């Protein structure tokens, strides 16, 4: 079964070239009600839905090791984004779909990974990014990678304006190859949904 | 074994595929708690010193394995060679407290002092990397095991007890230029 | 032969907080009885919960007062055991000897006006995350808050909740932290009727789950 | 009792280690336990 | 919670009033016997020294907590660094007795002497304040744990055992002038 | 009298890996809960088995490629955890801290060509005993080997067997050993069809019976 | 637990020797155990 439909709230995504879903580090969330929020946290399901971001253009000239990253959360102009401005503390996991649409006559390979506590990796460390939750996108096989990760961090709730626990990373493993019948470049997009969104500590209004 | 590589599902083929036989393995030496449980040097010292495991050497056995994890937890043992009495204060204490006897203070007894200390951070686990700031690169100041002070601190060894590691990160061997193998003098009998 | 032992390097030195006892030298001493001596306390937090002590506002007064009947911020203070306003309280006197705490801190408000003076107040807990505390009840309404008016019962008590990223917070405050790490408490007067010279006395006590841990000896000696 | 954590008994008898109390009670614990909580009046939650 | 403040009845409201949940608390560190059970310095010494807990420093962890009680009881441990032999006599002894060997006398053994002593006062409890005179301000002379004497007494540490405290009294933190918070350097990792 | 003991010469010194514990000094500390924190690993080899990491070929590429459709040796490397090609792998990163190993090492081959590119490959394990590795698939056919072609499944995995005189082998390599003590792995392209710019990505993981023993601290510090 | 091999108990209580954990899981062991082995397809052995 290569055809998968994912639903997050009133948004869905259907892909006919998937290689399944990779769960990173766990298949469930730690407890969302601990001592640090004194039972004042609440869940906001209206934020649990897909938002979109263009990551980069995969062109033939990008060599092995070329890396593009997106720290999460990112700027969000919807419900999730308003939560970041209205509550002091939050926690959520991520449901991540990355697509790279060219055609089956393209060759090459991208590594898609979710990295906790991002730090710039040296060139030698790039050979080991598969230690992190990941999938590959290779035109001969799939156009979509799908990874699901839980919230984590030294603190049970976080202040996202000060710390970003997860970073989506896309790295060229083998360069994009082109033919007379292939696409000439592939635009890479992310379709991301925050999961199990909890907030605590309502803030005053700015005016 | 043949599979879909893109899915990234673990695949562990064996010699049975071509008629061999998989043997018994004993992995006690690569057990995490066991391997981290030995003393290593801290090295950059001052008479007032905040205990931070990230000050272990990055290529040392313990320092490298610690950096190959994102989060960790452990209790601690320290061996300190010092002049004067040694005082320790927990994570969060005002530096000024290091001057008082009411905090655990060890009176000098040659050749050095060995103590067992509990984890005292306010976080459920600590991290070796932290992507963000802690103030209103570096690690938040709260990532420590307390601080010690003596007239002079000559040497400090730390030992992680009942260690737990989470979320593996890259761990590198020396880079090789030989084009075939990194070669070095392995111990061998004289004459 | 006799038992062989390894006298071990690194052990045996005196540690001021060690868990062992000294050898005795003067036995059989029986003490005068002290059965049921009154006023015993076995845990500092039992005392801290039961006996609220006064906050300190401008000019060393344990109360706030206002002469205008308009809505106003009567006081704002850091949620910190090291706050200026908490500096003469028993809770802060105890907390200075521990490195960390978590749990509820209870504020008590006692109105002392005459029978013909009435007022309506509001207390809000403002978490970290904003540059400055809200100056009006309207902006602060979006925070966790309570409003109450004066009447037969002169006292109102409100729990300041423990809401933070980590499970414990430091009792002391560092020189580097500019705005308070745990937020603020803001006390407003919504309005009043003929309460110009009348005051609201404020005190603080430990809540049911308030906890202090990791004993330290920090004062200059 | 207090700050002591030896799993093993004391080599000396109690009549030597400490003074012995004679007979002829936690007030603050009772006081704190007796505190009122909740509200007062009528709730509309 | 709303109440009659004048009655002064304890009232402990909780976060449940507005929908929160009260957590578990572990208060071992504020247990009285536990907190007083550690060694602290005495400081003003002489070759002949009467053991008086009121000579602990008033802002020290033990000295401040002791002064925050009106009456107390405890046994004691002392650590004494001295030249010559150390003699101890109980509460009530003539000072002259300090010169004789028949009283508990500890022969010098480096680096110092540690002893367990029983409470020996003639009163059922002692007090940190006493409103009156004892002769036919200061505390009655009978409020002591005996006296010690050696050729020279270099250092003296005391430790309250099985302490009991009664009738709480004021306990103060440092006064603050900052107008917002008392700030100080909290320990944090180097570099 | 009291118990007589012999304080024994030669015992009691601190040894950095001793199996005893220090005396404690600060009791009753309860930690924030960390129940079910995700991503825990309790043995380094669980990680090494589950997460293959990339080999390093000429010019720092995790793959081999060939432009001719003729049969050719695409790569040859020493079966050594100290091999140049293994130098950026997690398996070698762990192995440097142990003196010896035994057991299976698994190689993974992932073809990344377009749908219209096809190839047939061969991997052979050449034990010690010959001067130089075979340069053609025909000579290498007499060794333990596997051949496979590209298709719907892009990945092929092959176990490098542990075959040696002794029960364990050294993880490091000595300055005196000229040809590798454990043999070689040779990867050949039998032929291909329109696969000139297409690559074969190679990674390595620990096999089921792979084992490391005798912890050492060898890096320059 | 770890690198310790005394046949005899510890003289001190656990509440002193170590910190005590409270409650409110080996991911990589599960991940490795779950790996596919064998082949895929049809064997002609």
Author numbering:
A (entry chain B): 12 to 218
B (entry chain A), E (entry chain A): 1 to 136, 156 to 210
C (entry chain C), F (entry chain C): 1 to 221
D (entry chain D), G (entry chain D): 15 to 38, 65 to 85
The authors write:
FMDV is a non-enveloped single-stranded RNA virus belonging to the family Picornaviridae. The capsid consists of 60 copies each of four structural proteins (VP1–VP4). During assembly a 95 kDa polyprotein (P1) is cleaved by the viral 3C protease to yield VP0 (36 kDa), VP1 (32 kDa) and VP3 (27 kDa) which self-assemble to form the capsid. The structural proteins are arranged in an icosahedral lattice of 12 pentameric building blocks which are the major structural intermediates for FMDV assembly and disassembly.
Initial production of empty capsids utilised infection of mammalian cells (RK13) with recombinant vaccinia viruses that encode a P1–3C expression cassette, where P1 (derived from FMDV A22) is either wild-type (vA22-wt) or carries the H2093C mutation in VP2 (vA22-H2093C). In situ room temperature X-ray crystallography was used to determine the structure of both wild-type and mutant capsids produced using vaccinia virus at 2.2 Å and 2.9 Å resolution respectively. The crystals were essentially isomorphous to those obtained for both A22 virus and A22 natural empty particles, and refinement, using strict 15-fold non-crystallographic symmetry and real space averaging gave reliable maps and models for both structures. Diffraction from crystals for baculovirus expressed particles was indistinguishable, demonstrating that the particles from both expression systems are iso-structural (data not shown). The structures of recombinant A22 empty capsids were very similar to those previously reported for A22 virus and its natural empty particles. However, one region on the surface of the particle showed a significant structural difference: residues 171–181 of the VP3 GH loop adopt essentially identical folds in the two natural particles, whereas in wt and H2093C recombinant particles their structure is more extended and almost identical to that seen in another serotype A virus, A10. We have previously shown that, for serotype O viruses, the VP3 GH loop conformation is modulated by changes in the adjacent VP1 GH loop, so it is possible that one or more amino acid sequence changes occurred in the highly variable disordered VP1 GH loop during native A22 virus replication and account for the repacking of the VP3 loop (no sequence changes were detected in the ordered portions of the native A22 virus capsid). One group received A22-wt and the other A22-H2093C capsids. Two of the four animals immunised with wild-type capsids and three of the four immunised with mutated capsids were fully protected using the criteria described in the European pharmacopeia. Baculovirus expressed wild-type and stabilised capsids produced equivalent titres of neutralising antibodies, following a standard immunisation regimen, over a 34 week period post immunisation.
